[PDB]
Amino acid sequence: EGLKTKDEVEKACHLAQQLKEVSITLGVIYRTTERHSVQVEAHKTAIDKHADAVSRAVEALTRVDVALQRLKELGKANDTKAVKIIENITSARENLALFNNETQAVLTARDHVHKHRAAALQGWSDAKEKGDAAAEDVWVLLNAAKKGNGSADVKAAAEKCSRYSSSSTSETELQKAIDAAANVGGLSAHKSKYGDVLNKFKLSNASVGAVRDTSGRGGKHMEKVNNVAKLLKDAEVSLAAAAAEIEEVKNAHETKVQEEM
Incomplete structure (x- = not known):
């Protein structure tokens, strides 16, 4: 089986084009993930800045919990001023x-974006390796079809065939080309090669979809981070006051117990 009819040549031509288009279309699709890598890196920087900005609030909250733990040890955590302070600070604790939870979610999403992006990249690279080589195999038949005992129409079609598709490929178009070529004896020797190209295309493409969805979830977590970071910073002065008050309460109960022993 060489390609002897115009129909066989055209089905081979279209396939070879689509296989060669795999790397070009996938590079385009891959390049859409760069904006998501930039976004997640931006989230990480913003988180580090928020962590700095909330640290005085956090320090005050730790002081409150330290003092409360000591009041609980003394059996005086039911002191009405302690109770009042704990009420006042519970929203900040929350x-x-x-x-902490939303920043973790943002950072997991960041990790997942990079991982999906690395898989998209490797999928692209495997797809190109396979696609370019399978297209070369087809071109053996196409080039042979320019000469010999095929019809004049077969040879002319082979002469006309460009290396390149005029538009982007897809899972559907590549599969359509493969399925059309299933009818063609000489091309059928490479069927498994064609399959593996399509599987790598799918995998790369799916990874790119995962980058985008992951990155969208990340952004929604980051909105909540931004909202709660501001609430903490805003509470910083009242939290420092609460920490001093409950420390005083705790110190009074310590000295009452010392002086009573």
Whole structure:
């Protein structure tokens, strides 16, 4: 089986084009992930800045919990001023837990973006390696079809065939080309090669979809980070006051117990 009819030549031509288009279309699709890498890196910087900016609030909250733990040890954590202080600070405690949780979610999303991007890249590279080589195999038949005992129409079609598709490929178009070529004896020797090219295309493309979805979830977590970071910073002065007050309460109960022993 060489390509002897115009129909066989055209099905081979279209396939060779689509296989060669795999690397070009996938590079285009891959390049859409760079904006997501930039976004996640930007989230990480913003988180590091928020972590600095909230640290005085966090320090005050730690001081409060330290003093409360000591009041609980003394059996005096039911002191009405302690109770009042704990009420006053509970929203900030809750906001700190949310900041920790949403920042973690942002950072996991960041990790996942890079991982999906690395897989998209490797998928692209495998797809190109396979696609370019399978297209070369087809071109053996196409070039042979320019000469010999095929029809004049077969030879002319082979002469006309360009290396390149005029538009982007896709899972559907590549598969369409492969399926059309299933009818053609000489091309059928490479069927498994064609399959593996398509599988790598799918994998790369799916990884790019995962980058985009992951990055969208990341952004929504980051909005919550930004909201709660501001609430913590805003509470910093009242948290420092609360820490001093409960320290005083705790110190009074310490000295009452010392002086009573």
